Amino acid sequence: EKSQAYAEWKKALFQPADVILDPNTANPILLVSDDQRSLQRADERQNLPDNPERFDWHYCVLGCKSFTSGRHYWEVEVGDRKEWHIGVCQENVERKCWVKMTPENGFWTVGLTDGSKYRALSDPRTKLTVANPPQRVGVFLDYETGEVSFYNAMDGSHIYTFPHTFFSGPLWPVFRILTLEPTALTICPA
Amino acid sequence: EKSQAYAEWKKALFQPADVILDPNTANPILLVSDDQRSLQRADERQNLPDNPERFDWHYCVLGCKSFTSGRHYWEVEVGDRKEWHIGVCQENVERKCWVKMTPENGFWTVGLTDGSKYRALSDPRTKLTVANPPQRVGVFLDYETGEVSFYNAMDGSHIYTFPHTFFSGPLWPVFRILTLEPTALTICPA
Ligand SMILES: C/C(=C\COP(=O)(O)OP(=O)(O)O)CO
Ligand SMILES: C/C(=C\COP(=O)(O)OP(=O)(O)O)CO
């Protein structure tokens, strides 16, 4: 059973992350749920303080915990949301000015545009071919081997693995949404 | 550098397998080189014994040693070949009658058809998008987690990961070539 083997694999090798959204980091156009599990976009930017930790250009928010070591996974209910990008980024990313979200710029993210265009946000972007659109996505980090990978968390099918790299400093769970859609992104608890 | 990270990741996690081909398993249309590292195809079936372990239908050959446990990798020079498939199969796969080469039938393989069509031999087959056609492919096995994955061995880019599974019995390196063409399939030594 592919669900069973996915469950047994993630349990054997990856620490289960309990990820909550940090509204202090969130671009002003983002709405973070009271339980800090769910992410929607506002109509327009809210008036929030431009504290140094807040994303002011990218429509990004971070988790409340970073990783400097170990294997970690978390799963995100993306449901039928037609646009979303998730993964990890370095503590030291540019949060204020425009930069391309690329591994070179400290972002390892994949996701969906316009309902049907899956991409890895590599440089240049990798067009994914996804036979079964995921409803829940597992994010898998191995700090020591520089590994960031993504799976369909319902059927265990692989989506994308970045080239193995070298990480500098802490890695944060990162979430980006560009559009207004009925379906929020929701983090599954550990 | 992605090559260096690829080298450090296989060193951290995977035991380098020294794979040689077992000519007694090779379909009678295949030629195994005397050093048992290279594979070619004949114009017709040659006259060989139909010993039980020989693939009579599928243009396959196994390695000389199996895996019942652990993390293992080997790399295969596919060069400019227009057709090839490689991966692992269970000891108990059908050798004589036709079976579809699928995980359900005990086969975990990916490869190339008609020079440009990269596929995983899932059921259904998964169409791959590969930006840089590999000359050398890394095959990565984790027996315990039921993981088979494939990399471009030269630049470290990921090709394909099968859904995690549960293996039954020993796994063998398997190699398949269907075409009569100038470039051999060559295994890289450990
Ligand atoms: C406006 C915006 C993001 C769009 O960035 P880009 O337009 O660079 O596109 P992508 O390839 O999706 O990163 C806010 O995060
Ligand atoms: C004739 C032959 C193999 C072709 O099998 P199939 O025609 O099932 O094709 P594939 O999807 O490539 O496995 C001998 O191994």
Author numbering:
A (entry chain B), B (entry chain A): 324 to 513
Question: What does the report in the manuscript say about this coordinate set?
Answer:
Vγ9Vδ2 T cells—a major subtype of human circulating γδ T cells—respond to multiple cancers and infectious diseases in an MHC-independent manner; they are specifically activated by small, non-peptidic diphosphate metabolites called pAgs. The sensing of pAgs in target cells requires a surface protein, BTN3A112–17, that has both intracellular and extracellular domains. Here we show how—in both humans and alpaca—multiple pAgs function as ‘molecular glues’ to promote heteromeric association between the intracellular domains of BTN3A1 and the structurally similar butyrophilin BTN2A1. The BTN3A1–pAg complex functions as a composite interface that directly binds to BTN2A1, bridged by the pAg molecule at the centre of the interface.
Among these, VpBTN3 accommodates pAgs and is required for γδ T cell activation. We found that HMBPP, DMAPP and IPP bind to VpBTN3’s intracellular domain with varying affinities (KD = 1.37 µM, 92.7 µM and 96.1 µM, respectively).
